[PDB]
Amino acid sequence: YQGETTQTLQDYLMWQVELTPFSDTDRAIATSIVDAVDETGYLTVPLEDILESIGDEEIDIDEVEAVLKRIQRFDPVGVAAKDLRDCLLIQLSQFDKTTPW
Amino acid sequence: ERDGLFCARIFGPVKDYECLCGKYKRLKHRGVICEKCGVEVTQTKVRRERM
Amino acid sequence: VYSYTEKKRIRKDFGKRPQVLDVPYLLSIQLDSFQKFIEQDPEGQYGLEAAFRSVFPIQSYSGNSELQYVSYRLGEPVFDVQECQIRGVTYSAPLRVKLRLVIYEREAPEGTVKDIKEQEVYMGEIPLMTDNGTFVINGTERVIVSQLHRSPGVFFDSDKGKTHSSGKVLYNARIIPYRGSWLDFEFDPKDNLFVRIDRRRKLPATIILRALNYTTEQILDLFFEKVIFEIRDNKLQMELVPERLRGETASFDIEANGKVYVEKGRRITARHIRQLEKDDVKLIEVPVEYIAGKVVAKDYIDESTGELICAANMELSLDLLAKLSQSGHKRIETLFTNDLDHGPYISETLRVDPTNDRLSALVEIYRMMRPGEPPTREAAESLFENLFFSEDRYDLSAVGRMKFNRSLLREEIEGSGILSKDDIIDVMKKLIDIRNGKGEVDDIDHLGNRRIRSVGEMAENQFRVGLVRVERAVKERLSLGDLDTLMPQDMINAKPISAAVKEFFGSSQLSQFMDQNNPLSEITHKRRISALGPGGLTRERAGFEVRDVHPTHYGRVCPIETPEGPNIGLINSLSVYAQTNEYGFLETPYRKVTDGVVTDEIHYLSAIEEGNYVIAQANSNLDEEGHFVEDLVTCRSKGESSLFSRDQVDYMDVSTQQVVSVGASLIPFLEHDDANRALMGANMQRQAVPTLRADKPLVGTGMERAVAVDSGVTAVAKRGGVVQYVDASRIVIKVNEDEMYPGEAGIDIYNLTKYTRSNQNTCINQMPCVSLGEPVERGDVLADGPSTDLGELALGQNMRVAFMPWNGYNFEDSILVSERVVQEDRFTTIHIQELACVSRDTKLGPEEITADIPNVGEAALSKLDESGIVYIGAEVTGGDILVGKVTPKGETQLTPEEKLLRAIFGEKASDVKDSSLRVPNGVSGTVIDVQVFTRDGVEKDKRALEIEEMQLKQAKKDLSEELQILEAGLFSRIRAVLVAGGVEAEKLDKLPRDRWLELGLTDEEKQNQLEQLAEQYDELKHEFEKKLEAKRRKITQGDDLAPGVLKIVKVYLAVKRRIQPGDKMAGRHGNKGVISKINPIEDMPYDENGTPVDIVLNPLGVPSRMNIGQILETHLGMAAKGIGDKINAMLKQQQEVAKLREFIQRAYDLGADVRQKVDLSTFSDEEVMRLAENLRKGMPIATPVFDGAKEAEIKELLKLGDLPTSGQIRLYDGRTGEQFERPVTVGYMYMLKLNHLVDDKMHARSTGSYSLVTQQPLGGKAQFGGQRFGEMEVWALEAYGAAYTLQEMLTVKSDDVNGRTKMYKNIVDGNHQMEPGMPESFNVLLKEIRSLGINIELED
Amino acid sequence: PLDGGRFATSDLNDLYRRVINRNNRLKRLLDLAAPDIIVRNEKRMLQEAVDALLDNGRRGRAITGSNKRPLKSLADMIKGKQGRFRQNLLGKRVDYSGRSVITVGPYLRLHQCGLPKKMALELFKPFIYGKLELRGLATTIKAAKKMVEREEAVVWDILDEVIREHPVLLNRAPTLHRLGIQAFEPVLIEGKAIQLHPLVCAAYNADFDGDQMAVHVPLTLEAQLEARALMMSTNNILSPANGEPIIVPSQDVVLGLYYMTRDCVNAKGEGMVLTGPKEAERLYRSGLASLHARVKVRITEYEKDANGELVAKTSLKDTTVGRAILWMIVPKGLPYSIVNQALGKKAISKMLNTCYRILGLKPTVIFADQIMYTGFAYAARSGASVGIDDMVIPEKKHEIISEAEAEVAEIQEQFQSGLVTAGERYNKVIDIWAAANDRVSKAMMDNLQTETVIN
Amino acid sequence: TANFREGLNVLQYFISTHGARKGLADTALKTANSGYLTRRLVDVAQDLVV
DNA sequence: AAGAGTATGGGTG
DNA sequence: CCCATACTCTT
Ligand SMILES: [Mg+2]
Ligand SMILES: [Zn+2]
């Protein structure tokens, strides 16, 4: 007997990371960020933990911020948000300005 | 079950980079042997190549 | 004289031979078998009674108490067949068996009756057979296929010298019981007999003889003949029988009475034997050398010494003769053996046999049976006793005993079920006689040696298998002493019996889902014979011989209809008139010929009986009074056919369709088709899909009505009467007065089946074929089922076809189809699919079926009702929600972020998650039915209540329909009584009927009668109220679901499939093809009147296939359409009824001495007009499979319709208007749409899911799998030398995990380059080999 | 994992559990110093359990499950037709593949196949994603994925652009030789069936009555170039087994070419002198001349010189209208005698072989396509059909049968007189019937093959 | 003595069924042996290269 | 004391 | 069905 492979949220996120024009450093940062995402779609660790997990001192926090901002626009929109306010604002930023309220 | 045919202490983690009890969970703790459950913090695919 | 159904549309018959025997009911083999299994038998030979009498009485070891069986009974089923199919349960009946526990005292004569207790106990559920010969198991119809196996008894065979390299045959015999161990005897190249038990180690043949308490002298007496030498004081004077010297040569001077009849060196001839017999020559002087090697019969002793002179079965010598000569012995016994005949085999078997006693033979038998254990006298004796002489372990059944006795030329047919010494001795003697040269071996494939076993016998066997286990358990539990309070109910458990019955009826190899493509499929499935199954053969080890057509198959097994492939010759079809014996052997009917006159007497003969007579063919001319016209008739006598005289004929065939099966009898002009294409056509005819509208063949054989009616797919009137109510869903018949029972309301109600899914995901729909107020009779068809048209089988459509090539679009069996065919929906089919949603119970809480899902939008919930279930009639596609369900996910810990989420977006979102049922991707249709199953004790939702109300309405309607008639009759009686005395006339009808009850008459009998009528009215109302309450209780009953299951919801979707290129079409003659192109109407070839054809077929496919029946069918269909066109033209311009009936009478009277006679002078004008209306699209025609129409009759019918005799016309090209250079055959053919649709075939995959272990793509369209690249494709790529293609196929497309991702990324980036790695299956292989303790590793 | 929370078990895990239980019991018994009569039995059972784990059934009995089925061991995983080697290593299932029913494409060229676009959309999905991202229609991978899921109008243009020159592999099972897989250029079609060239079916042993084929997509540049240069059907003209052509016409093409190259004694337009094949075609299409009429036509033919130069010669030839019409398809370099006859299957095969040996590969492919087109067209134009009157029975059949029956009767009476043995009579009867059958066959074939015409 | 245009009777058709079924069974069976033969031939000459 | 023949078990389909 | 090995009769 044998089952079949199933695609989870992290598998889909890594599939999107693979087909994104990242650099090697950005790809490692994205790998760590996706590793730090739970099944509800929220980031579980502060960016300091990710920066420490990268393992080199040549990288600043703003690069991690840029990679996180790029990742947060993946499908589904709002994934890897820091908190509820961040997720709501990310979802709103994808709406057209013609929205009434 | 511990010391059984699917033991995580012998064959490896059932989740990526998470020990069985749950003290160490992320990539910053890679290569760490937990002193409580004895499970290494590594990939869960090592269960395909550990006898 | 014709029935009402047949008089609406009479089919013209071209048969010429009268029928003396009707086609029997086509499902008798199932119904009779199950009735025999289930019915009450005063004797104990069949059914449950036989099984009960074979186990009971059950007696304990001590004998102080015992159990006895008195009788059994079957209760009424809880639900009906339709109710069981709706609820998905099994249609069965309870078994109530009466047992009696008797207690015996001690120290008393015989057995004293201390106490007797009788109790009726429950033995489980037994599935019942429906009226159509099916079983409903878990709400699905199932068929149990009959088995063709080897009959019990003794059979003699011989390997044809293949085992040994000297080309010598070895005769053997085999004894096979119905239940027990096999017993084999065999010869060897040394002419030594040997015995095998249960196919085990070979043993000498005398072991069994000694085990039967026999001595060497007795064995020699049995198997040899005695010769007596007398010592008459002079050189052993001998009494000679001349027959002893036949075939021999004299080794000495044979003289008698002074005359030397035979000299030295002269062989004994027949003349010498005759002279000796005439002269009664007895005394013969023989030399001592004549006894140099003779075998001594018995043991001899010396009176003086008192020792044994010699032992039995020993060669003699001169010294032994001297010893016996001086010991005062005058009689010597020897055995008579030679080389040509009476060969010594038993003596040599004794010589090789090491045993010389009786106790050691049992020891050796025990050692052979069970090695590796010390032998025990008692154990060996019990083993031998129970091997073949115990009724509890060995059974030679009635058929087995009959065959055993018949094979040994016995006279008694009946006997015992166990072997005896006489049986084994006779088998040995018969085998010896076969070896000597007198007698013949048996034919295993002869149908007199093969037997039929049906569902009832198998059910009886399984029931006994359960019953013996129950008896063993009871005997185990009866040893303990508690009889003063024990009861039979507590002693037995009904679990093993029910488990065995369920296993047999649900998971047996011969129990299968019924083939439900069309009525012909079901008929064929119910008449199937299998050589496989438990106790049969296997396809891997069958052999050529068992797959061949045997001469005894004639009339019993169809020689045409058999699957092509591995199972060829192993699956068979019953013939039309075939039956079974009481022993289970196939028999056929014949007409008896008495003194050269063929009579109407019918005799059913089996294969053994048939070979002893000369039987004439059914194609033999006869006079008016029944005399053969010729004097040299063709007949079959002993497996061969030749000419015989008129007075040598004993029997004649009853019909020309006696040899074929039901499916083969439906092929017109079968005698003009090759057998291979006939087999293909018969196989393909039963996989046609019903279309939207049925169409009768218009060229048939006459077997359509029988198949349509005997299948049970139609509604048939149980009693005659008038159509009181007709509707698209129900029919109500007002029964005739003389067919009614006393005290009933004479109405019959038929509820029709509407758009129901079948086992093959097709549509089952019934439509009425009667009008309001018309008379009906018992047996008439009231409504047509699928593939039925006015009570006739209708599997396809009539197509206008031409035979010509058309620009390569009919190349290699391709089919060109007109667009008008598609526009008229002539091959459009309905397909119904089922989906299920199950709500279970979890530890976190039960799952809820609801319409409130928090994570989906309002638009996606628009098609769900208030209960979360889709509406009836909604159009859905892939991804749509059918049933909304949520699964609990609550936790007892609330984090601040969780509290914020619950506060802002509600608590329902944080507690449950979506687990709804959605339409699978690539599926579409319309919701036509929803069913809800709820466990008993759980509250019902709105949808279930609506369904139950709809169910209650119909029962209320039927009960009201009966009550109306009954109360109208009663009130008519009341009014009649009121009129006779105290009549009010108009005032009586001014008041309603209830006010008639509020009246009184004189003190005479009038008031008493009125009171009686009122009491009857009250009783009738009470009875109908009780009936309605019982129906409501049955409807509202809860469901018995699987453990942990709360609710189930089933949704049905209906879709319509149109014809398209890639679909498979076929005729009835083995002419199959695939549609290649749909052609616009103005591109098709057309005739002088501008009429195009529907189909274009390649004429190149006819000559090499030799299926000429399609051309004749096309010509005859052209003629039939011409007659129909004449009738239609006559109808369009209103003409007199006289002209119409004159032309129709001319059409029916055509032919060359046809048996059919139609007279329209007994038809009314309305009936004539109705018949003409039903004939305006072509006159249907019947041609039996060997009594059909000739070419001259076809040409005459073409002439009647003003059509060319050749059957060919001129056509014009649609695209250019130019005439084709040669005439083209144009006509009508019956075409079928098969169940190989290109919608179910096309599949493609880019990437998807993989196996967990091998990491390779899955297989199958349902799994969205990939195609397999096997070894032969690898060989092809190697032969090309395409190494990179092979490597790419091997690594980055199947199981190189990183290579797959890298290749996908590179392809997206526009860089077509791979980075191959190691396949994962090789690593799995390395790990598996290491797990075996072997060190295998990669190096450098 | 099964529905309801049940986890069931596997054979390997069951065997491991049995071994572990036996080992633990034996350890406990040896620790407590149990009597030897028990420990010997425990050791024997442990040996049996290890044997069952390693190779179940090889030693004596086999341990079975609930349904009386023997459990699978490691050896069962390794060996057999269902083992690793034959099921996962020598062959496997692959991505980028499909299958469906095959129909005939009479309009296709030899290097082309007909592919449904519903299959092609799934087969070429990552190529379409890359092409969508390349020209700015999609900015991210999810945008292209959603655009393809919606099946917008531009994705069809993208698909037509990405499959322009990209061979695919068609395979029919069983693959008996290397001609069972061939490469073709796809043409996007509507419907759900694959269209196949009529001239390749003989190589596939395929017919259009239910057969299905599988399709595979090469990915890398090396695979595509191997498909174009090694496996293209235009390269597989000759047979690797014997060197003979395998794309020879059959059936309808042969029938049409045979019909158009026959002559009739007195046909319309007979006896006129024509200026060339074009005048013959004009006369035939106008209805002024018959296809079978015997005429004289001016023909120019080319022959290769000693150094390989085509030299022309012109002359008047006695031929028919149909042969002159067919001559317009023959390439330069072949003699006119190759068509001036009634062309059967063997003649057409010889013509193709001559063209290949004299001129090369490309003219042979063009010639084969033209031959197929002309054969189909004229087979359609002929109107050839089959009727019951075409099967003409000889009028002497019954007389021959009666003579044979009389001989059988007289020899049977002679045998009944006791003059011959049984086997001799049987052989004589068989010989008589064989002779009668030969006579009937000769009479029927003599009647069938000739007809009477008015001069 | 009959052809397919004029038609066969019951006995002649029953006689022809023997050969029909024998041919069909032989065709159904021989492929399994042909596959084994070609497998062995491929096994014996797998590695022969110019 | 070897040598040829027979019975049994393994493998394939 | 075909081949390899242990056991039995014969020169
Ligand atoms: Mg085919
Ligand atoms: Zn831990």
Which percent range fits the helix content of chain B?
A: under 10%
Number of helices of chain C: 34
What is the subunit organization of this protein? part of a larger assembly
Outline type of chain C: globular
Rg from Cα of chain B:
10 Å
Q: Structural class of the helices, strands and pairings of chain B?
A: little secondary structure
What percentage of the residues of chain B does DSSP assign to strands (E)?
under 5%
The profile of the biggest β sheet of chain C is:
7 strands, mixed
Largest interface: C-D, 107 and 96 residues
CATH class annotation of the largest domain in chain C:
Mainly Beta
What ions, cofactors and ligands are bound?
A: magnesium ion, zinc ion
Number of strands of chain C: 62
Architecture per CATH nomenclature, i.e. the level-2 architecture of the largest domain in chain C? Beta Barrel
Name the beta content range of chain C.
Answer: 15-25%
Distance between the termini of chain C: 96 Å
The description of the largest β-sheet of chain B is: none
Binding site for Mg(2+) (chain D): 207, 209, 211
Organism (chain D): Escherichia coli (strain K12)
Function (chain D): DNA-dependent RNA polymerase (RNAP) catalyzes the transcription of DNA into RNA using the four ribonucleoside triphosphates as substrates.
Family (chain D): Belongs to the RNA polymerase beta' chain family.
